[PDB]
Amino acid sequence: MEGLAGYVYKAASEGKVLTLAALLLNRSESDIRYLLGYVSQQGGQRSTPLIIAARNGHAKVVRLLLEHYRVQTQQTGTVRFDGYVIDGATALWCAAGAGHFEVVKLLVSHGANVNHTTVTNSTPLRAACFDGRLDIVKYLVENNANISIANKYDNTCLMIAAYKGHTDVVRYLLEQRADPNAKAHCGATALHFAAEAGHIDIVKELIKWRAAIVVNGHGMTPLKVAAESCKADVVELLLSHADCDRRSRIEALELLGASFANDRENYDIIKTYHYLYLAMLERFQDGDNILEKEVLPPIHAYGNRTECRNPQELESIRQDRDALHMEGLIVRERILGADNIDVSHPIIYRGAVYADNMEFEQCIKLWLHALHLRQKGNRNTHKDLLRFAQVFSQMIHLNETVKAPDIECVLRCSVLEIEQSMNRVKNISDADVHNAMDNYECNLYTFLYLVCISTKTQCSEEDQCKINKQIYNLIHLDPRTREGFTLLHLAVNSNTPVDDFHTNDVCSFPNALVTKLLLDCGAEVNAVDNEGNSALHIIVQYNRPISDFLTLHSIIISLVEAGAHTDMTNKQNKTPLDKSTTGVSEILLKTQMKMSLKCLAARAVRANDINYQDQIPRTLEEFVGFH
Amino acid sequence: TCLMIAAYKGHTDVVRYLLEQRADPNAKAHCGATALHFAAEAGHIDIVKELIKWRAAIVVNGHGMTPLKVAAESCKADVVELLLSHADCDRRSRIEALELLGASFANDRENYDIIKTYHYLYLAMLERFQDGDNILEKEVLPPIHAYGNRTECRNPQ
Ligand SMILES: [Zn+2]
């Protein structure tokens, strides 16, 4: 029966009245009304024949359905655009999103319900604003569309239209007395959206309506937002339209200069120097009436970090573009503060370019500041910690790493914290965070790479003690992976994701020193994965015995010590001696294997099937289970 | 022939193309060395694997020098791995090759790894006494004053 629904869907997508009529003809009234009510979620989005006709922009099909079949226009579907899914949208919403003017004309002329209840509170006017068609917006608004209707984020149609940057729709909505004073969830105003868009005409139109200057939650006044977005024209327009004190305009000018210097997109130091010099002359313009200048305390990350306050002080800094950039960073960090996370992007970039070729030191300290900032926030830094891993690989390849253990201890604390946080995240839900489970695995890999870095380097015994404190903190809590794998199991298996930036002379699996240090920490040797495979069961399977024979010999002689059972059957009977395939690995085991009567008795009593339940001390039940 | 000299050089693409022409790789020279010997000297594991793929058999030169032994002499472990894996051989030849590899690591200047030599010889000799009550014999040549004591070891102690 659903085949008829698919045929109607295809006919609606085609746009032919003849095919759709023929498919709907020779069917009962109930059948055709069920076809109209049915939604074929081919892409997982509800789309009734009217809804999908509106989305596909076929005027003929929409006209036929509305005129001859009386399909309900109040049907709402969770249509998705560019991956993002709106959880509710009527037929008129899809018509506006399609961008076809005849379809929206017909649907509105057939009494389409513009105001439809929706969990996302989406409206067809918002869809038209997203599409940007002025004519569709006009036709929707004229025929009973409430512009004041906003989504769950309190984002109105006018707000998103100003964000888009289309001057026509903003002008039309302002003509229809659309209120721009509504506040979104963040509380930003329409002036903030216009400054972000960078359209001077939108800002001028908003000023014409006399929109109030309202500071957002994290500061971010419209002049400050425009200065951050490098909208010099918008900043000048706001300063001219709204009177500001000396402090406000001087701060705006210096923020604009520092933003121009710091960002890689602009990358103009002459404009930055000119703006800073102008602002500081404005500080001293009056004469004996000087704006109070504060100096941030010196920080080892920024070096001297002396914020200059006199004209000769910047005059001495005409050259040394690095000094100008770091001073702009100081200015931006002082003005903006650490309240928001917007300053996360520049600092790393300022490190990144600095990280092109040099000792990495103040780059590392800048990234440490970025780490602190991102750890105040609940923002995932697994990509960032990867980047630190490749940077460490770079410096160890350069052989000039001379690494300081304080930084590695700090990043170990951070990675432990994020491990715990994302473990709780998986404790909340699983399906949505499957990619977060992939990041779980990746972060375990990063810790192994950090352990490989620590093994390659060497430092003071107290620093090693702190490293071992952190690794024991990670070990005491028992990490697990899909199908179950301890740290040792990864450390002995062929860990597929070897660092691509540096895969040679660094991070090679089947390592001996890593396993030695992990045993020193005290990981549970007799831990069993799914199917019960022990550590020895995933080291005798090595396929290159004659090469790298030193590694195999060392790992075997290390794991045989620290108490590892010589025989530990698991699921189907597989002794470590049976599973070995090389033909060379058996020798190393049989040299180190130590015999005892317990093992022989257990093998004898399990080979034959004798009852061993409730006739044996409870401890030996597990012993018999092993052998 | 271009085949053996290309194998000596180690250019994988040209050797692969020449083999594609179905040229017989069992050709010989005045020295009697087959392309396997030149590949072993080059040590390209992929070249040797490709040669084995199309049925290149081990052939002994008149003065001994089986390609496996020749590869073992020049301290080329990977070729030894590959040939031992594919080319079936007895206990005696395998242990002889392992001992030769140990000695070559011991004395030569290119690698000069004392521990690798010790461990390889230890493994070979442990393989010698594996069975028990059926022991491969070890023949010791009379001492040479050039080496001083010049007496080999046949007991693990
Ligand atoms: Zn036992």
PDB file of N, CA and C in Angstrom, chain B residues 8 11 36 39 63 65 73 89 92 95 100 108 112 116-117 124 127 133 137 140 148 153-156:
ATOM      1  N   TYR B   8      70.018  -5.809  -8.384  1.00  0.00           N
ATOM      2  CA  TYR B   8      71.136  -5.286  -7.605  1.00  0.00           C
ATOM      3  C   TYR B   8      70.925  -3.816  -7.269  1.00  0.00           C
ATOM      4  N   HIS B  11      65.640  -1.003  -8.041  1.00  0.00           N
ATOM      5  CA  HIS B  11      64.508  -0.244  -8.558  1.00  0.00           C
ATOM      6  C   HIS B  11      63.314  -1.177  -8.723  1.00  0.00           C
ATOM      7  N   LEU B  36      68.188 -13.734  -7.088  1.00  0.00           N
ATOM      8  CA  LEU B  36      67.946 -13.792  -5.652  1.00  0.00           C
ATOM      9  C   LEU B  36      69.171 -13.339  -4.869  1.00  0.00           C
ATOM     10  N   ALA B  39      69.386  -9.544  -5.097  1.00  0.00           N
ATOM     11  CA  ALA B  39      68.355  -8.961  -4.244  1.00  0.00           C
ATOM     12  C   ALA B  39      68.738  -9.063  -2.774  1.00  0.00           C
ATOM     13  N   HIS B  63      80.390 -23.059  -5.530  1.00  0.00           N
ATOM     14  CA  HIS B  63      81.094 -22.905  -4.229  1.00  0.00           C
ATOM     15  C   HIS B  63      80.086 -22.550  -3.130  1.00  0.00           C
ATOM     16  N   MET B  65      77.470 -21.015  -0.889  1.00  0.00           N
ATOM     17  CA  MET B  65      76.842 -19.668  -1.008  1.00  0.00           C
ATOM     18  C   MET B  65      75.359 -19.733  -1.395  1.00  0.00           C
ATOM     19  N   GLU B  73      75.195 -13.436   5.626  1.00  0.00           N
ATOM     20  CA  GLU B  73      76.562 -12.952   5.783  1.00  0.00           C
ATOM     21  C   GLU B  73      76.609 -11.430   5.856  1.00  0.00           C
ATOM     22  N   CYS B  89      63.572 -25.618   5.105  1.00  0.00           N
ATOM     23  CA  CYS B  89      64.932 -26.092   5.309  1.00  0.00           C
ATOM     24  C   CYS B  89      64.983 -26.934   6.573  1.00  0.00           C
ATOM     25  N   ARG B  92      69.782 -28.100  10.586  1.00  0.00           N
ATOM     26  CA  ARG B  92      71.204 -27.781  10.491  1.00  0.00           C
ATOM     27  C   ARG B  92      71.433 -26.469   9.751  1.00  0.00           C
ATOM     28  N   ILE B  95      70.196 -23.351  11.840  1.00  0.00           N
ATOM     29  CA  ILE B  95      71.085 -22.963  12.932  1.00  0.00           C
ATOM     30  C   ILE B  95      72.407 -22.429  12.392  1.00  0.00           C
ATOM     31  N   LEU B 100      75.961 -17.795  11.630  1.00  0.00           N
ATOM     32  CA  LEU B 100      76.665 -16.909  10.712  1.00  0.00           C
ATOM     33  C   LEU B 100      76.210 -15.467  10.886  1.00  0.00           C
ATOM     34  N   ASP B 108      81.784  -7.288  11.996  1.00  0.00           N
ATOM     35  CA  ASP B 108      81.781  -6.285  10.941  1.00  0.00           C
ATOM     36  C   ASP B 108      81.735  -4.871  11.520  1.00  0.00           C
ATOM     37  N   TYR B 112      78.364  -3.826  14.165  1.00  0.00           N
ATOM     38  CA  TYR B 112      79.180  -3.934  15.406  1.00  0.00           C
ATOM     39  C   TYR B 112      78.282  -3.955  16.653  1.00  0.00           C
ATOM     40  N   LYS B 116      73.384  -7.980  20.342  1.00  0.00           N
ATOM     41  CA  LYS B 116      72.615  -8.688  19.327  1.00  0.00           C
ATOM     42  C   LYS B 116      73.299  -9.991  18.938  1.00  0.00           C
ATOM     43  N   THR B 117      74.620  -9.952  18.757  1.00  0.00           N
ATOM     44  CA  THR B 117      75.370 -11.167  18.459  1.00  0.00           C
ATOM     45  C   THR B 117      75.216 -12.193  19.570  1.00  0.00           C
ATOM     46  N   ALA B 124      70.405 -19.601  18.869  1.00  0.00           N
ATOM     47  CA  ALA B 124      70.780 -20.706  17.995  1.00  0.00           C
ATOM     48  C   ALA B 124      71.216 -21.920  18.807  1.00  0.00           C
ATOM     49  N   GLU B 127      68.397 -23.640  20.475  1.00  0.00           N
ATOM     50  CA  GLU B 127      67.737 -24.471  19.477  1.00  0.00           C
ATOM     51  C   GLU B 127      68.508 -25.762  19.236  1.00  0.00           C
ATOM     52  N   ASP B 133      68.421 -35.625  24.655  1.00  0.00           N
ATOM     53  CA  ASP B 133      68.707 -37.031  24.373  1.00  0.00           C
ATOM     54  C   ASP B 133      68.835 -37.279  22.873  1.00  0.00           C
ATOM     55  N   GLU B 137      75.334 -32.588  16.996  1.00  0.00           N
ATOM     56  CA  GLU B 137      76.746 -32.548  17.338  1.00  0.00           C
ATOM     57  C   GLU B 137      77.346 -31.190  16.995  1.00  0.00           C
ATOM     58  N   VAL B 140      84.492 -28.975  16.803  1.00  0.00           N
ATOM     59  CA  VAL B 140      85.388 -27.880  17.153  1.00  0.00           C
ATOM     60  C   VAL B 140      86.717 -28.097  16.446  1.00  0.00           C
ATOM     61  N   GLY B 148      94.688 -17.109  19.864  1.00  0.00           N
ATOM     62  CA  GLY B 148      94.997 -17.382  21.253  1.00  0.00           C
ATOM     63  C   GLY B 148      94.459 -18.716  21.726  1.00  0.00           C
ATOM     64  N   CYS B 153      82.556 -23.008  22.139  1.00  0.00           N
ATOM     65  CA  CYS B 153      81.713 -23.387  23.265  1.00  0.00           C
ATOM     66  C   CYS B 153      80.616 -24.327  22.782  1.00  0.00           C
ATOM     67  N   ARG B 154      80.392 -25.409  23.527  1.00  0.00           N
ATOM     68  CA  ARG B 154      79.335 -26.365  23.223  1.00  0.00           C
ATOM     69  C   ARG B 154      78.483 -26.698  24.440  1.00  0.00           C
ATOM     70  N   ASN B 155      78.703 -26.019  25.564  1.00  0.00           N
ATOM     71  CA  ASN B 155      77.864 -26.147  26.744  1.00  0.00           C
ATOM     72  C   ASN B 155      77.350 -24.770  27.136  1.00  0.00           C
ATOM     73  N   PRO B 156      76.077 -24.664  27.529  1.00  0.00           N
ATOM     74  CA  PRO B 156      75.494 -23.334  27.773  1.00  0.00           C
ATOM     75  C   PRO B 156      76.222 -22.537  28.838  1.00  0.00           C
TER      76      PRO B 156
END
